[PDB]
Amino acid sequence: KNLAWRPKMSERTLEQFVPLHLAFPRRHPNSWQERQFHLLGYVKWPKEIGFYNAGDNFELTPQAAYRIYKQNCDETFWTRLHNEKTIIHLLPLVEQDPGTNMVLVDDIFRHHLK
């Protein structure tokens, strides 16, 4: 009869308070995080290639993306959306140095148009 531990309420009243969808005291330890990374077929890449940024999002590096383009220009699976995605990846480079990156955009442009 401590009431901090065994309160005066029936289990019928109290069973609504049992969390079945439990959030904060989490069920996933740290040791698993890497393992569950591997089973999903994901691959750790070096910083040049890309990375998972603050929102845990995998963003592909510019000058990394352009090389992926220059390997994959003529590939069968390479669709026209891949080109515009590549160009989208090049934009910060476009602003911070327009002289040497508009040539890249024009390369993708001409190659796409042919």
């Binding site: 009869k1 065994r6 049992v18 005291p25 989490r26 330890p29 040791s31 995080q33």
Partner: protein, 179 residues
């Protein structure tokens, strides 16, 4: 007799001693060092085990059973401690009060509601009592060398706790086996 009948008691105003501040034959504080255990993501029971062994003094090569010499472990982030699967909801904590009605069956979730710190204290109690039961001074004295802080704010900057780098070798999740 050797051990007296007039004994220090909980209702007696003299009060119960703190073994950290006590000076006794079997208490050596000279060669201890302070550790920092971040509990984020690590399973409660495992953390309890590691902490229990630093605290008890078993991690030393010169460790002797009757000589209690521990390291102070500052266990930080008790709130983020991870218990696997349904266990938060299914793992009991049972104790028996001596009086009519000797059963308190209380879920981990409820103990976590009241204090998160009491969970870590509970499993520390268990992992220390696993090797020491039969003498009170050997049970109680180590436990005071745990400092349980449920987030990243602690008074102990002055002891320069060294981050205790530990990875649990056990792959599987903890398993509740208690008869």
């Amino acid at each position: 007799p050797f051990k007296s009948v007039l004994r220090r008691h909980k209702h007696h105003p003299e009060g119960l001693p703190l073994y950290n501040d006590m000076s006794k034959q079997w208490l050596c504080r000279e060669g201890e060092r302070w550790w920092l255990l971040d509990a984020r993501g690590e399973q409660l029971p495992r953390v309890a085990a590691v902490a229990a062994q630093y605290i008890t003094g078993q991690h030393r090569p010169d460790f002797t059973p009757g000589m209690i010499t521990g390291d102070h472990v500052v266990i930080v982030n008790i709130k983020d401690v991870v218990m696997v699967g349904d266990q938060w909801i299914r793992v009991p904590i049972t104790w028996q009060t001596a009086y009519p009605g000797g059963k308190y069956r209380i879920r981990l979730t409820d103990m976590y509601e009241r204090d998160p710190c009491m969970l870590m204290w509970w499993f520390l109690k268990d992992e220390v009592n696993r090797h020491f039961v039969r003498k009170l001074k050997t049970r109680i004295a180590p436990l005071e060398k745990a400092w349980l802080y449920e987030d990243s704010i602690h008074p102990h900057a002055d002891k320069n706790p060294r981050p205790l780098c530990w990875t649990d070798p056990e792959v599987k999740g903890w398993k509740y086996r208690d008869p």
